[PDB]
Design a protein around this nucleic acid. Structure first.
Lengths: 179, 147, 168, 135, 178, 37, 131, 62, 342, 53
RNA sequence: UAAAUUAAUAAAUAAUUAUUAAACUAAUUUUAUAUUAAUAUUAUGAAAAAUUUUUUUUUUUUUUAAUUUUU
């Protein structure tokens, strides 16, 4: 078939005394090595290199009387959302921040409440009359919700806050383009 | 021995009073400290070890008759050379030979593959059968641990 | 493109003005005018020659280079390769592993070193009793000797019961 | 379990023993929602004080790395302010000061200095000496 | 730093100054970011040299503070400039079972992009103070008294309570806010 | 022939050589009544 | 600037009660039906409880928030593996509406039965009483 | 493929035959937005016809 | 087997997903001139983009008043986000002048959809799909104002489409994709992958309703030539779009295995609207003899120059054979001289 | 689709672009405009013929 | 992915895999489902008794991942 003998012939430079010399015996070797890197990478490299990290964040937790058996269950209880490789980065470069975490999980602080579902506003039920001019009652509140969340994010000096300085006037930016 | 992958530069000198503590367990904690696993910077290539001084060996404990019915068996090359020796039979010879054998069971567990990693962590434990030990000047800090 | 300065300086091009495989000469009709508009500082050195090497080549401002074989490559696949010499900086052949996610590791709070948490120790949360060796409070005295009392009252109670209930 | 040959991947060590209860506020339970499992109450745990942000996170205020290396050196040195001195003691509080100030780790070694300056330490037949100003 | 209690905005205000790091969550990975780093992330569709800002932030920290945002931290600015859009080193694999006479050379090189971070800046708004060993908000904040002190664990009752050094047994907790 | 009573070796000097052939549902998983050295 | 949505309408129930109130933690016992083994949520039940799915790179603030944006505030366009997500989350609804849409028709024409179970389930379990 | 990553073009122009790219206002020899293997103008292969072939007039003749 | 898609199915790739560029005017062409021929500071755009999509969802729901508000905000944050007359700040009002007109306020509608154009012609190269979206609003608010004289702007709007809309690039890549399928009786739904120009070329879809909203005008006023002046154009508009999609069938049955043909099929193909426009006779390749070794029988000095060189003879291959085969070919070099001499 | 012209999308190629070969003229191309049947290698045989077995 | 089998007057199809093609309706979630024809292909081998563990042969790279306790 196709031995990939083109690619695997440049590699014969970095082999020992026999595979480097003779082209045949080098291929059976370099194609045996390359076929086991890809065999170890996709199969066994994870379960090993994934436990040298759960040993480093753990060993860095014993210096605070806790351990991975307890830390793992309470990094999640608090919704902290830290990859187990990140906790090893902190335990090794930012030792205080890690410790600061380890104090939180041990503290009796209420974890953040589970995210809420979709709540129907009251105004969805509130019977609308036959009025065409004014907007629906639910949009005048939902839109207000969107512009407050629009100004709370960041400290955008919207032209040093040249846009309407207050909200009830920002919802009237449609009258700015009327004559 | 300087030999990069050694790291004698951040050493801490522990002290594990073996008095009354179980011999198959003092060999466990002392291994996490010689192999340097108690360190958050532990990478298996580096042998960042911390010297342990396991004084008071002769006061070790072995639950039940495990002083009489646990063999230190080793089979040499000569045919008919299989040797069986209890703990109460090697304790006649040298009490530290039973602790150094129970350490060898723990360091091997993670380092059997390469000779440089099999033996180097073993040279970090100083097995002293009583109080006296020449390491007063190394300030062996008594490591806290509860089995 | 570091600090707003393109790491690329000049794309070397070899082509044939008349021979064949027009996907290069076709590229120089539509895409190249457009790609030049975005990055003008890139100095596209186009060479005409009879026997044209099929390779695009870029020269970065540190002496480094790169080639991109365009033999049998259509015009769309030359522009794509055009835009890929201006992008990279040709500085490091790093494997995107979990160790090389950060090219510089600077810890701002100082690294963990042995002597950081070495002199800490386990502690309680609201003051404990040295309940071994503590001068009791006059109420404590009355409590324990009432407990210890109620204990002695039980032992010496049943020691007699073993002999008296035998002839009660 | 995962290539039954044998499992030599570093396992996690069991959890240290919690501190004494001494409070009777249910400091005993584990399937109780009033607290997480981990029980870390160390020497300098009360310096890690937390402030509840508005988003939902907490702004823990902690002492700087150049301060706990001061607290430690204080503790380590006044072990005996007039008592015995250990070779291991001096070499440690010689580094805690070097860690106190700009703790980038030297990049080279810790003993290359001594190894090269042992000629004014050692007296070696002054015809073969090393005087800073070679006569 | 925004805050309601004027004393807090007068003691915590100097904590958030100096250098600052942050651990963002970009491309299902997690990078500990600081104002002068380059981090290779999975390919972003950002033309080279263009400014960029990371939206998912999990924790900010400085020399004497860390803001532990539980799921994420709102109102933290971390902006980077896309330096490179390159293909990383090739991870060559060979899939040739012994039975069949076929050999599949699957050579995949990763598509990353190097984000040289400009700056991190953080201005958090606190609600107040809460003591650790009772997760209740505190009414008032005294910049010196720790809300919950710590005490020894050796009640003497335990004959084999492991003694550390004598000095490790008795050690205070220094004041640090001043 | 009919390969019966496998033996799963754990290490040595910590398995007692009677617990090797244990993990087989039988009169083993007991203590050898009369051991020989 | 950074973001934290955690929902479609945000509107997060703020956690901090009041300068002196009680904290009101969530019950850490996993909902086991028989109650004798007395378990505790395990680091992947907390992750389910907290609004993520099994792994937190799913159905949470880890995808639905964009990875980046331009410094001027310009968002970033969608991708193949973004539209394919939005359609999936709309599939997880159409799976539920069309499901409840057929139950409605069955219960509006009185087709849903009255004896609870199959013909082969009642003929299997004794605890489902006789009809 | 994409082996031979260097050593193709010497990094220099030729003496008097290599021209860099001025810009999109000028036109190179050979460039055309259509794939032509035998590129020809009305000077090299001049068609002998009244008109010039075109999509408008169906054939270059009367 | 099948696929349930009950899990999350990552997207497929396809050439229908290429980032098709926008459409503009040529370099110097300005809109008001073409017509009469016939860093930034932070602003939460990502949040206001969600705030106008609820206008596109609203103004498409019949709630034209509520949409006006949502559009009001997003049209405010845009005249601050972008500089003056930016191609974007001009386009948002085109959603406002519509939302105005659908609320009686036509007086402000025309006041809005006319304001945009001075942002467009005064630009460098405006988004061509917008100037046909403005010239549509300008044509619809004139209907709402009921002015038949104000209705001949549709036909003038499409006058820009027919002129400045190269109708090839919409379906350039998608033209050969039917040559990608290689199965004939299973997964054969790939041989008929049809993408629709109304769904892919917006400017074409816009230009269609113009030429359909313009017909209803002339149909309403009982105008005859007006209707035909549009219908023939509405057909000529589409006919030159279906033409740019035509192609013959390649193989029909199941070709097996030649997966490496994936390179000749999907590639940049000259569209039929272009293969003629840039024909190699009308658009002549420029060939500079300074870089080649051939020139017509009179331009013999203008070849790529050389060095000390003397024409030996013509390479008649029989010069190698014995001298009796070179006693032939004797005068064939003499005779050939004066054939290349004028 | 980009959010605006200020923020264009980049050119980072995939295999569906970066490996393609020139468009040798199909039969509909040399039907539209017979000016592209330059040489005899253009007159390729029936498309139904796929190559030798 | 193991399935097929009748020597011999008027009883619907051997079966497999393969190549090439074909058609949705009394017959429910608003579920699910490889059916048909033409051609290519018939040697992968049990003897007694008893009777009316498990899913794996095969992975594009980075992460991520729920089955552990000794006598």
């Amino acid at each position: 078939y196709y031995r990939a003998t083109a690619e695997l012939d440049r590699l014969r430079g970095m082999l020992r005394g026999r595979a480097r010399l003779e082209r045949k015996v080098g291929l059976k070797r370099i194609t045996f090595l390359m076929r086991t890197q890809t065999r170890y990478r996709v199969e066994q490299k994870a379960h090993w290199e994934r436990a040298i990290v759960r040993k480093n964040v753990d060993s860095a937790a014993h210096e605070h009387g806790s351990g991975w058996q307890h830390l793992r269950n309470d990094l999640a209880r608090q919704n902290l959302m830290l990859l187990p490789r990140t906790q090893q980065q902190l335990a090794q470069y930012e030792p205080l921040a890690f410790r600061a975490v380890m104090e939180l999980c041990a503290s009796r602080v209420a974890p953040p409440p589970p995210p809420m579902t979709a709540q129907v506003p009251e105004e969805a039920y509130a019977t609308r009359p036959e009025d065409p001019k004014v907007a629906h009652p639910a949009a005048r509140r939902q839109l207000e919700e969107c512009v407050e969340r629009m100004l709370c994010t960041g400290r955008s000096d919207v032209l040093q806050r040249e846009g309407p300085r207050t909200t009830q006037a920002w919802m009237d930016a449609w009258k700015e383009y009327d004559l | 021995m300087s030999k990069q992958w050694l790291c004698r530069e951040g050493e801490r000198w522990w002290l594990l009073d073996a008095r009354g503590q179980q011999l198959p367990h003092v060999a466990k904690i002392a291994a996490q400290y010689m192999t340097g696993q108690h360190r958050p910077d532990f990478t298996p290539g580096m042998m960042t070890g911390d010297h342990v001084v396991i004084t008071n060996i002769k006061d070790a404990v072995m639950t039940g008759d495990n002083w009489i019915r646990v063999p230190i068996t080793w089979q040499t090359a000569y045919p008919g050379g299989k040797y069986r020796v209890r703990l109460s039979e090697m304790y006649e010879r040298d009490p530290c030979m039973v602790m150094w054998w129970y350490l060898k069971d723990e360091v091997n567990r993670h380092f059997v593959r390469k000779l440089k990693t099999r033996t180097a962590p073993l040279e970090k434990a100083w097995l002293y059968e009583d109080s006296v030990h020449p390491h007063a000047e190394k300030n062996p800090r008594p490591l806290v641990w509860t089995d | 493109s570091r600090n707003g300065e393109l790491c690329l300086q000049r794309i070397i091009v070899s082509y044939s003005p008349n021979k064949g495989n027009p996907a290069m000469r076709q590229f120089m009709a539509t895409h190249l005018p457009e790609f030049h508009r975005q990055y003008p500082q890139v100095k596209i050195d186009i060479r005409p020659r009879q026997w044209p090497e099929s390779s695009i080549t870029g020269i970065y401002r540190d002496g480094s280079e790169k080639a991109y074989s365009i033999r049998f490559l259509s015009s769309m696949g030359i522009n794509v390769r055009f835009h890929r010499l201006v992008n990279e900086g040709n500085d490091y052949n790093h494997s995107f592993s979990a160790s090389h996610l950060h090219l510089q590791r600077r810890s701002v709070q100082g690294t963990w070193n042995p002597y950081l948490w070495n002199y800490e120790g386990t502690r309680a949360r609201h003051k404990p009793p040295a309940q071994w060796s503590r001068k009791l409070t006059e109420k404590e005295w009355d409590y324990y000797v009432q407990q210890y009392g109620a204990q002695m009252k039980a032992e010496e109670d049943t020691i007699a019961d073993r002999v008296r209930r035998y002839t009660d | 379990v995962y290539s039954s040959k044998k499992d030599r991947t570093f396992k996690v060590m069991p959890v240290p023993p919690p501190p004494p209860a001494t409070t009777a506020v249910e400091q005993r339970d584990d399937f109780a929602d009033n607290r997480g499992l981990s029980a870390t109450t160390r020497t300098l745990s009360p310096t890690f004080r937390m402030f509840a942000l508005e988003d939902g996170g907490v702004l823990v205020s902690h002492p700087s790395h150049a301060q706990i290396m001061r607290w430690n050196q204080r503790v380590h040195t006044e072990e005996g302010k007039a008592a015995n001195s250990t070779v291991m003691d001096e070499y440690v509080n010689s580094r805690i000061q070097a860690i106190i100030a700009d703790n980038t780790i030297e990049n080279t070694s810790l003993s290359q200095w001594r190894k090269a300056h042992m000629w004014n330490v050692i007296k070696s037949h002054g015809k073969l000496q090393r005087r800073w100003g070679t006569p | 730093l925004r805050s309601a209690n004027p004393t807090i905005a007068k003691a915590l205000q100097p904590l958030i100054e100096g250098p600052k790091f942050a651990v963002v969550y970009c491309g299902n990975h997690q990078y500990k970011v600081s104002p002068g780093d380059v981090i290779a992330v999975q390919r972003l569709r950002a033309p080279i040299g263009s400014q960029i800002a990371l939206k998912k932030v999990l924790m900010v920290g400085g020399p004497r503070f860390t803001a532990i945002g539980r799921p994420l931290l709102e109102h933290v600015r971390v902006t980077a400039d896309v330096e490179e859009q390159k293909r990383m080193r090739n991870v060559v694999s060979l899939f040739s079972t012994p039975g069949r006479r076929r050999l599949r050379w699957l050579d995949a090189q990763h598509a990353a992009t190097i984000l040289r971070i400009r700056e991190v800046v953080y201005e958090p708004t606190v609600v107040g103070e809460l003591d650790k060993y009772d997760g209740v908000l505190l009414k008032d904040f005294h910049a010196d008294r720790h809300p919950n002190p710590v005490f020894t664990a050796n009640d003497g009752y335990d004959l084999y309570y492991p003694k550390d050094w004598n000095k490790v047994e008795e050690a205070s907790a220094f004041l640090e806010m001043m | 022939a009919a390969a019966a009573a496998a033996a799963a070796a754990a290490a040595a000097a910590a398995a007692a050589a009677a617990a090797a052939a244990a993990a087989a549902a039988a009169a083993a998983a007991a203590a050898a009544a009369a051991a020989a050295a | 600037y950074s973001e934290y949505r955690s929902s479609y309408t945000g509107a997060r129930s703020a956690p901090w009660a009041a300068p002196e109130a009680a904290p009101a933690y969530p019950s850490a016992r996993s909902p086991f039906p028989l109650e004798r083994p007395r378990f505790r949520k395990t680091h992947i039940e907390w992750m389910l409880h907290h609004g993520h799915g099994d792994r937190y790179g799913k159905y949470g603030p880890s995808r639905e928030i964009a990875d980046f944006e331009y410094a001027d505030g310009t968002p970033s366009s969608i991708s193949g593996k973004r539209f394919a997500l939005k359609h999936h989350q709309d599939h997880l609804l159409v799976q539920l509406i069309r499901s409840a849409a057929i139950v409605e028709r069955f219960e509006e024409e009185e087709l849903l039965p009255r004896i609870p179970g199959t013909p082969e389930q009642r003929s299997w379990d004794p605890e489902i009483p006789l009809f | 493929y994409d082996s031979r990553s260097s050593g193709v073009h010497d990094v220099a122009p030729r003496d008097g035959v290599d021209f860099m790219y001025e810009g999109p206002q000028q036109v190179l020899p050979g460039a055309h937005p259509l794939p032509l293997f035998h590129p020809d103008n009305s000077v090299t292969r001049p068609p002998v016809s009244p008109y010039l072939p075109s999509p408008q007039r169906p054939h270059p003749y009367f | 087997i099948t696929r349930l898609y009950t899990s999350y199915f990552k997207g497929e790739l396809f050439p229908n997903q290429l980032a098709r560029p926008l459409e503009r005017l040529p370099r110097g062409v300005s809109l008001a001139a073409a017509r009469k021929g016939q860093r930034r500071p932070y602003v939460p755009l990502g949040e206001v983009a969600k705030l106008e999509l609820q206008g596109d969802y609203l103004t498409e729901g019949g709630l034209h008043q509520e949409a006006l508000e949502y559009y009001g905000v997003v049209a405010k944050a845009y005249e601050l986000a972008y500089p003056k007359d930016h191609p974007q700040v001009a386009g948002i009002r085109l959603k406002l002048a519509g939302a105005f007109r659908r609320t009686g306020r036509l007086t402000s509608s025309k006041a809005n959809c006319e304001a945009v154009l001075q942002m467009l012609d005064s630009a460098v190269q405006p988004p061509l799909e917008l100037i046909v979206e403005a010239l549509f609003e300008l044509g619809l608010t004139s209907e709402a104002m009921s002015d038949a004289a104000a209705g001949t702007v549709f036909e003038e709007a499409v006058a820009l489409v027919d002129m400045f809309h190269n109708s090839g690039q919409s379906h350039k890549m998608l033209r050969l994709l039917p040559r990608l399928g290689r199965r004939f009786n299973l997964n054969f739904e790939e041989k008929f992958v049809y993408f629709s120009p109304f769904d892919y070329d917006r400017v074409f879809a816009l230009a269609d309703q113009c030429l359909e909203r313009a017909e209803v005008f002339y149909q309403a006023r009982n105008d005859r030539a007006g209707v035909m002046r549009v219908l023939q154009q509405r057909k000529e508009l589409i006919d030159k779009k279906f033409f740019n999609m035509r192609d013959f069938a390649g193989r029909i049955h199941t070709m097996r295995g030649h997966w490496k043909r994936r390179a000749q099929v999907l590639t940049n193909a000259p569209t039929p609207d272009e293969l003629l426009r840039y024909s190699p006779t009308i658009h002549q390749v420029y060939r500079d003899f300074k870089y080649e070794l051939n020139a017509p029988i009179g331009r013999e000095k203008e070849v790529q120059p050389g060095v000390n060189r003397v024409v030996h003879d013509m390479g008649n291959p029989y010069r190698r054979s014995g001298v009796r085969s070179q006693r032939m070919f004797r005068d064939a070099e003499k005779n050939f001289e004066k054939y290349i001499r004028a | 689709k980009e959010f605006d012209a200020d923020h264009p999308l980049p050119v980072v190629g995939t295999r569906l672009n970066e490996r393609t070969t020139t468009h040798k003229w199909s039969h509909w191309d040399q039907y539209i405009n017979p000016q592209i049947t330059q040489s005899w290698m253009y007159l390729t045989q029936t498309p139904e013929y796929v190559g030798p077995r």
